Amino acid sequence: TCPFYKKIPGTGFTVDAFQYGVVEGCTAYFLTHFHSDHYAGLSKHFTFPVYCSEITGNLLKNKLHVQEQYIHPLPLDTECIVNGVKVVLLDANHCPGAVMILFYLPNGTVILHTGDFRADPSMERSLLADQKVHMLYLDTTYCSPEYTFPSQQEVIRFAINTAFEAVTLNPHALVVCGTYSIGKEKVFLAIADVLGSKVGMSQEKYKTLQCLNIPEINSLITTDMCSSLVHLLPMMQINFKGLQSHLKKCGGKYNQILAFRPTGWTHSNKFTRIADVIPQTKGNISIYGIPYSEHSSYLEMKRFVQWLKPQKIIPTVNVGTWKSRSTMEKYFREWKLEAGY
Ligand code: NI
Numbered sequence: 001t002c003p004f005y006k007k008i009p010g011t012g013f014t015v016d017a018f019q020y021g022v023v024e025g026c027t028a029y030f031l032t033h034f035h036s037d038h039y040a041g042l043s044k045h046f047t048f049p050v051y052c053s054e055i056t057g058n059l060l061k062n063k064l065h066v067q068e069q070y071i072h073p074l075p076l077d078t079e080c081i082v083n084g085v086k087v088v089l090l091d092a093n094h095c096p097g098a099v100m101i102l103f104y105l106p107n108g109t110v111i112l113h114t115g116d117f118r119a120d121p122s123m124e125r126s127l128l129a130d131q132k133v134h135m136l137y138l139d140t141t142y143c144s145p146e147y148t149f150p151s152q153q154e155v156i157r158f159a160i161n162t163a164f165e166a167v168t169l170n171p172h173a174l175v176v177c178g179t180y181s182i183g184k185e186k187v188f189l190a191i192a193d194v195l196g197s198k199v200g201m202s203q204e205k206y207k208t209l210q211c212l213n214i215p216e217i218n219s220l221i222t223t224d225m226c227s228s229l230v231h232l233l234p235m236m237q238i239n240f241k242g243l244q245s246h247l248k249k250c251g252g253k254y255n256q257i258l259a260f261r262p263t264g265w266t267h268s269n270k271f272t273r274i275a276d277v278i279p280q281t282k283g284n285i286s287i288y289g290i291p292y293s294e295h296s297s298y299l300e301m302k303r304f305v306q307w308l309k310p311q312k313i314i315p316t317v318n319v320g321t322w323k324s325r326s327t328m329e330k331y332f333r334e335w336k337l338e339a340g341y
Contacts, residue, residue, distance in 0.1 A: 005137060005314050008113070010105045011085055015113050015137070018042050027083050032115025033098035034059040035181055042066055051082060053089060055097025058211040059182075077127060090126050092117040094294045095183030096212040102127065112308075113137040114316075119296040119304035128308070136310035140317045141295040143328050147265055148298070149291045150274045156190050158274050159260060159290060163191045166258045167229065173256040175230045176246065178238035182208060183294050184262045189220050191260075192230045200228030226253075235261065240282045247285075256284040262292035302335055309341040 006017040012027030018041035031052045044065040057073035060066040086104040094116045103111040112133045177188040192199045238261045279286040318324040
């Protein structure tokens with residue numbers, strides 16, 4: 001049944017709750033972003049109102065064939081009224097089209113649902129600064145102090161310099177980048193930009209990317225693989241067997257692969273600096289695991305919550321084990337006592 005942490009009290013609203021059938025007494029289904037654990041259950045057969053960003057609305061229509069009459073896109077940073085309740089969508093700094101939702105309840109409570117987010121100081125200057133938030137439904141994916149990672153900027157710098165060096169040393173090398181959902185587009189687009197190539201990909205992936213309102217995208221992507229030296233493949237195929245295979249397919253146009261797997265976290269982060277990352281190599285194939293995250297680190301998350309000072313926190317991730325739940329609650333209490341709220 002629909003968990004309590006996907007329900008907004010005092011409303012008829014749910015968040016990211018499409019896999020439970022008809023939720024009893026739900027008058028509006030909000031969708032924070034187009035990732036499968038969150039959209040699971042949507043299709044052309046869905047007939048209730050769906051509220052979301054423009055970008056997410058584009059993916060619903062074109063990828064899942066949801067009918068237009070049930071899609072309610074909302075502009076960001078704009079006060080809107082939904083079934084008699086004031087709401088605002090804010091940028092979540094997650095994947096394209098991902099939002100946080102501010103609910104202004106009739107009784108005076110103010111609720112922020114982060115959806116999936118990467119907290120950032122820039123959020124401290126949105127419409128959030130303008131009033132107090134009573135309850136926070138928090139993306140706690142990396143809520144433990146071992147989760148550190150570099151900025152997105154440092155990671156992109158590492159990937160660009162790596163790729164540029166490799167191809168300039170060997171103009172017959174191919175670069176490959178893995179993907180399994182929207183998000184992390186900067187990795188492959190930044191690399192193609194430094195190499196003077198477009199990114200080649202499957203028709204289905206090109207279609208997805210054309211839904212995202214990314215500026216000048218027609219200049220960066222293509223379905224012509226032959227004309228491109230940066231190839232996007234399913235994450236599953238980013239291994240020595242899958243890459244040896246792909247290389248056979250290019251028919252002696254290329255003689256080396258340099259491949260990137262943007263992971264969330266991996267335990268090399270506790271020890272290793274971004275400067276110090278090395279690939280796994282076999283023959284003429286190298287694979288780099290890079291810590292490009294679109295979720296908050298522990299310290300980023302803490303700064304955001306100590307800034308916001310919510311009266312009550314409801315975690316939305318890692319809620320299935322007692323030991324996880326109990327550890328997170330301990331961190332929230334620390335943060336509150338350290339900051340004085
Ligand atoms: Ni997500």
